[PDB]
Scaffold this active site. Structure first.
Site, PDB file in Angstrom:
ATOM      1  CB  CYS A 160      -0.984  -0.006   1.186  1.00  9.51           C
ATOM      2  SG  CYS A 160      -1.838   1.536   1.516  1.00  9.51           S
ATOM      3  CB  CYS A 163       1.138   1.394   4.373  1.00 13.09           C
ATOM      4  SG  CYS A 163      -0.585   0.907   4.729  1.00 13.09           S
TER       5      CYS A 163
END
Length: 244
Positions: A160, A163
């Site tokens: 991600c 993230c």
């Protein structure tokens, strides 16, 4: 054009997934062993027609798929059942020999609802170094649900982009608390939620929650700007110890 124990592969996988009953995998590295094990387990497949589909899978080419059945990597032959509906995995112990008798008992137990679904977990890390505490499924209760500590927990995925953008700041937060006068009472933690089954129902990544000391049944979900400053405020405002 297919036998009772079919071949699990690129052409057949989606039909096995859409069939709407579980799928038992017989992993072996060579076609010879695949055939031997298929012959040994055929009467089980016969008895389970319409309740469990059985198939062989090429462990040389597709060995990495064992991991997605919560089997250990590179220990073959191996057997596991995938409850497609509930997304649950039931590996059979790979230190044990695959025999008609053993697999029949295992399968009967499965159908009878007598086996607890396996839990996906990275191992507990041997050493706790780096200022952000590494949580895995096996230590979640111990770390996150420690009632004496204000625990900040980040649920992340390695694929991600969001993230990745948060990581350096979340690290700086952990280093800050680790040097502070609150180092005894605030925990800054992270968990790869794609590599560990955690209790929390996560809708998207990253998600950050505070589990306060004395209020572990009421975690607070973070919804601020994701700045270090704003996370410190969050901790001080929602934690038992007002730690900033």
């Amino acid at each position: 054009g297919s036998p009772l124990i079919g071949e699990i592969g690129p052409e057949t996988y989606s039909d096995y997934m859409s069939a709407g009953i579980p799928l038992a995998y017989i992993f072996a590295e060579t076609a010879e062993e695949r055939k031997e094990l298929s012959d040994k387990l055929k009467p089980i497949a016969e008895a389970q027609r319409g309740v469990i589909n059985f198939g062989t899978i090429d462990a040389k080419a597709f060995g990495a798929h064992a991991g997605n059945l919560n089997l250990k990597t590179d220990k073959f032959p191996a057997f596991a059942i995938q409850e497609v509906a509930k997304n649950q995995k039931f590996p059979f112990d790979q230190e044990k020999e695959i025999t008609f008798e053993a697999i029949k008992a295992f399968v009967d137990d499965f159908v009878a609802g007598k086996i607890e679904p396996s839990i996906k977990s990275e191992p507990i890390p041997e050493k706790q170094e780096g200022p952000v505490t590494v949580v895995v499924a096996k230590n979640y209760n111990e770390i996150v649900l420690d009632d004496t500590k204000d625990v900040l927990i980040e649920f992340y995925a390695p694929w991600c982009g969001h993230c990745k953008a948060l990581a350096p700041k979340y690290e700086e937060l952990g280093a800050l608390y680790a040097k502070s006068e609150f180092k005894d009472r605030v925990v800054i933690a992270k968990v790869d939620a794609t590599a560990n089954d955690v209790p929390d129902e996560i809708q998207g990544f990253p998600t950050i929650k505070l589990y306060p000391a004395g209020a572990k049944g009421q975690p607070v979900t973070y919804s601020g700007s994701r700045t270090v400053e704003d996370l410190i405020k969050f901790i001080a405002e929602n934690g038992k110890y007002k730690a900033a």
